């Protein structure tokens, strides 16, 4: 029970220090492109594209302090991130969702509106993330719960090519039970708050794997290739 507290401090703190919180960011915006989609807006393309190429150097960041992440085997560090990297940064810029102004917001503070998500890359994936972030909120997840669910969809064993998967399990228990004790001491009231966010796990693994999809046309639609590492993601 105190490692397990511990636990939990150790990840939100990770979490934070990785993940800006909407209420932090100064929020900016663009006109390009703002009152009708298109196939691609170049500009967006290339801002959006950075800013992805960022965070999952922030990901990485973030699962080096995970406890007992890199006790892993190397190749094993790399295939967890390859297998979840899309998961969470799906789930990363669904937390940054502002339902008012039907706005999502990046770690340096660019406030895109749908039109423009879209037009950024999203494509015909657009509205189906949208609805994943707007059904996100009624869980009123806190910044320890989306650090804590992020390790978990990490630090998962199933992953085809692991070298020691039983040890990633392992890693992933305490994760599992913090997540629990944790949630359930936050809202008492309501019990079914951990299993519905297990289970947004697999919605996730469903949007990434449609945003593997879309890399696939939007390959077509850009004239070079995508950055370096958003390419080792998606191979
Ligand atoms: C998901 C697919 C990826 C598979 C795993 C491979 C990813 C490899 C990531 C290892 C990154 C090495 O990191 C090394 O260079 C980075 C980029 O100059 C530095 O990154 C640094 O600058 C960034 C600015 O873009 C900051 O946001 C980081 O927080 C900061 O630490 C690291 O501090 C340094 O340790
Ligand atoms: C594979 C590829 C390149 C193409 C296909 C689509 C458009 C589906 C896509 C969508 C994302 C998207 O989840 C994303 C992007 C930037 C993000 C930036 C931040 C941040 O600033 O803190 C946080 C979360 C982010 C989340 C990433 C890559 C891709």
Not at 133 to 140: K, R, T
Not at 197 to 217: F, N, P, Q, V, Y
């Amino acid at each position: 029970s105190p490692q397990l507290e511990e636990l939990i401090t150790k990840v939100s703190k990770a979490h934070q220090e990785t993940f800006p919180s909407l209420c932090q960011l100064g929020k900016y915006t663009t006109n390009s492109s703002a009152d009708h989609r298109v196939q691609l807006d170049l500009g967006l393309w290339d801002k959006f594209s950075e800013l992805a190429t960022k965070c999952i150097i922030k990901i990485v960041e973030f699962a080096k302090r995970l406890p007992g992440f890199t006790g892993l085997s190397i190749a094993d560090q790399i295939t967890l991130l390859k297998a979840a990297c899309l998961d969470i940064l799906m789930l990363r810029i669904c937390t940054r969702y502002t339902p008012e102004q039907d706005t999502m917001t990046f770690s340096d503070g660019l406030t895109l509106n749908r039109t423009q998500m879209h037009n950024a890359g999203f494509g015909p994936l657009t509205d189906l993330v949208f609805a994943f972030a707007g059904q996100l909120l009624p869980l009123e997840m806190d910044d320890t719960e989306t650090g804590l669910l992020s390790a978990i969809c990490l630090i998962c064993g199933d992953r085809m090519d692991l070298e020691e998967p039983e040890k990633v399990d392992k890693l992933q228990e305490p994760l599992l039970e913090a997540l629990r004790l944790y949630a359930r001491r936050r809202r008492p009231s309501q019990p079914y708050m951990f299993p519905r966010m297990l289970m947004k796990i697999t919605d996730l693994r469903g949007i990434s794997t449609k945003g593997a999809e879309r890399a696939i046309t939007l390959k077509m639609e850009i004239p070079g290739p995508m950055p370096p590492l958003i390419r080792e993601m998606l191979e």
